[PDB]
Assembly symmetry: C7
Homo-oligomer: 190 residues x 7
């Protein structure tokens, strides 16, 4: 009835071994290394501006806020890395064969939530660009209304607080995931 070609099965077994090796190295070495790198990034001066008047840009309908754009470019690669690394670790947890079954399900759900939240971060950076564009377009059509000029300054300041929250939250995820997977794996294995 159901049987597998030995040659195909052997090649599949190598895939299982490769995923396991990548996951063990990622949790043991990559996750800790990133926590140190992100903590230093928060300390850097660009993400620690005391007064938000400086981030504001000057217009007469054209230039985007250059200071904010540069911060976004540094943030985007880090969000992408968490999404790619998390997917590999999640598959390793699912592949592992085990009370123990319940613990494994909790770990997969927790990893799944981190992946979904990361996508939200990428989406919010995209939403800021479209929203700022609509308001900047509005200023040209109705020059006299002061509030339209005021809203564009507010959207720039809100993004700065938000981007710092994303970097801190990604650093939080690495330490929390590292500790949780290490404690849970011993129970899941047995």
């Amino acid at each position: 009835l159901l049987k597998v070609d030995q040659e195909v099965k052997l090649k599949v077994d190598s895939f299982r071994e490769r995923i396991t090796s990548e996951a063990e190295d990622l949790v043991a070495n990559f996750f800790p290394k990133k926590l140190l790198e992100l903590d230093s990034f928060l300390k850097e001066p660009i993400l620690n501006i005391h007064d938000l008047t400086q981030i504001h840009s000057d217009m007469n309908m054209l230039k985007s806020n250059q200071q904010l754009v540069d911060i976004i470019e540094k943030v985007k690669p880090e969000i992408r890395l968490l999404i790619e690394k998390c997917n590999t670790v999640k598959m390793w947890v699912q592949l592992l064969i085990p009370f123990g079954v319940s613990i494994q399900e909790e770990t997969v759900a927790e990893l799944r939530t981190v992946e979904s939240e990361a996508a939200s971060y990428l989406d919010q950076i995209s939403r800021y660009y479209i929203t700022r564009a609509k308001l900047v377009s509005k200023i040209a059509k109705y020059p006299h209304v002061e509030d339209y000029r005021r809203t564009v300054t507010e959207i720039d300041e809100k993004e700065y607080i938000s981007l710092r929250l994303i970097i801190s939250e990604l650093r939080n995820q690495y330490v929390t995931l590292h500790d949780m997977i290490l404690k849970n794996i011993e129970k899941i294995k047995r």
Copy 2:
């Protein structure tokens, strides 16, 4: 009261046998073969670009991003295959006659979820085209606003990360489904 013509019943029984044979071959041979093919596809250079500056396209309102379009064309057939193959396997699980009843219901629900998620992937590729079109149309109407030019570059980069996530997720589904159906079928049969 209720009785069936023998000739009609015999022809129906052949349909039941045909569906069962296709399902056993699909789980035992097709699902494993695809996992190997998709894993190689991820390794290929086009899906592994290190810097997302290269994927960006240059405009003066016309050409779509050629590099992204080519990647989408390769991804679409694979999503279609999972939808067609999953439907045949789901019917086999429903047809099987069996604690055992509960296990069978779990398998049908799990297969149903994979089918619905696959449709979502096809929908997101469609949404990207309509959204990019609206933003490209906006650039022509309001040339001066820089943010509108910035949003179209962002939508191209977001799609690249998303398409790679779809290929990895489809590879994840094949290994997870193969293992789950094989373990569950022994219990369902008895």
Copy 3:
């Protein structure tokens, strides 16, 4: 207090007998006959095109996709038949007088779900026409944007995969309903 004219009651009893006879014949003979007809329809070449480049239509804002329209015309009568036949069977289950009561309620709920899903299929065919029309209208207003031309090709391809899914799903419903009603009726009757 409450009593019924004998002449009116006799005519009502004939209605009850007529509905019962139609239902028994429909489950025993019509449902099996349709499963065979639909399975052959899937095998036919029009619903099995290997490459979706062929289904694409050529425009300079006018002609709809002729190949897709012809497939839709064949699909619509089959969806209509399931809705009409299911309503008659559902009334027979409700009329039957019976643990047994719970089984009867499950059957009515299952029949009700199949009826609602069938209406969804008719609605999706309608939505495709309105959506394709809006996008085709957009191409004329903004000729230069390539993405608008690309979206109309994508909507045609998505519909082809969807229509085949509807025919396969209707075939799935007939076999599942036939088996479920036959097993459940013995328990419901007793």
Copy 4:
């Protein structure tokens, strides 16, 4: 503290008697009579057209589909009658004084659901007119797009299947309500 004028109380008691008499006659005689009338209406040729090409109307932006309008005019009075008759029966169930209390609550909830569904039927007939109007208006603004012409034909065909479903469903409600109220009243009274 709390007491009622005898003259006012006597007049109220006559209202209670009148509602009870109308309800007993409606369930015993009106509900059965309607089931016979609606069953004959379904048999009539206008509601049984084999091919939906005939219902389609011919345009060059003006005339509504005459065949569909005539069917709607016959359907509207029947939906109105169920709403008015159901309200009187529901009040009788609430007035009755009684395990028995739970049975009474189930009957009121079931009667309430039938009343709400009937309102939905009246609403859908209204929605078809507004939707067809918008699409017919669109054809004039953009004559070349064929899909806009195709959608108006589809909306006419969908309505025909829907109107027949309403007549069959109203016939279903009468038989189901008649049987349920008669069985439940004996328990509710005691």
Copy 5:
């Protein structure tokens, strides 16, 4: 720590006595009197028109339906009275000091629901005016489309069935509330 001026407390006690007296008279006398008045109103010829062709108004974009407007003016005061009277009774139930506590909570919830539903009735009369206005405005912009003329006739007929349902439902509330409060108060008091 916490104590109240005797003079202020005495004046508050008079408020409590006044609310109690108004509530007892309203449930014992006002609620029954209204049930008789509304029942006669339903019997009156204007609310009982057999054919809905008569309610239809004739236009060449100007006059509202005079017959419908007159019916609405009679209905609006009655809906307002239920809202004002119900609020006073609800406060009396809350003030009463008492198994008994649970019964009191059920009565307040039931009174609260009647108050909210009454507001819905006032809202629907308002919605009809805005909706009819938009459709009448549409007829002038696009004279040729017949369906726009058809929709305005349909909205008038739907309102007539709805207004009669409101008057019957308000009559239903008075009898149901009268009976429920009288039965519940004895338990709540003890």
Copy 6:
């Protein structure tokens, strides 16, 4: 590890004492005083108009309804006072240290609901102004449609019934809150 500067702690303790004193006086004296003031306000002639024809304003697109605006100005300060006073009382309940714990949580939830409802009242007054403005703007663009003139009269009448409901509801909150906090505090303290 964790310790507090004595000087800072002493100043914080004075804040705790001040909040407690304000709350005890507010529940014992302010809440009762307001109930008497609001009850007299309802008795005043402006809020008791018998016929709603008088509130209607006469237009030829300009003046707002003066009678309604004056009533709104009196209502707004009272809604603001409940929001400010409720916040202080809620903090006192949270600060109190205690079966007893559950009673305290119920009181905070009840106080929180009253605060949220009060904000809704302020929002509805704002919505009326924007909605009336849109309809008044519509009358000028399309002078002939009578229904647009009719809707503006209806929105004025609906607001009058609504404003009286707000004043009565605020009076209801004061008596209910006074009684509930006094009964609950003895249990919470012990």
Copy 7:
């Protein structure tokens, strides 16, 4: 299998110590200091205006309300500080290793809710600017409608009550969080 480089582990341990020290100082000293500062801010005259006629600004489409803008500028830094400080404390609670486990989860959930509410406050300040702008734009297009002029005055008054509610609510959070974390930490540690 899983092991960590000693040098990397030592650097991570220093991160854990640094976060713990910052959290203990923040709860013991920063949270109490802020409560005193905010309480004085509420006492200041600008946030205590008796009549809201003064906050209103005079227009002939141009100037924003200067008095309101100045109040917003003072409020924004305080909301930002709570978001940044709360994130550090939340990580300390998660890092702590412990009935005790349940208490820790409650504290993290409570801290998470305070962080989300703070973001809502920043969002509402942004919404006021966009909404006031749209209404101010409307006044210019349609000068005659008085209600549009009335709505802009109402939006200014609503914001003043809202900003004072934010400052009071932030002061409430500091005292509640300080007390809760101090009581919970002893149980969480043991």
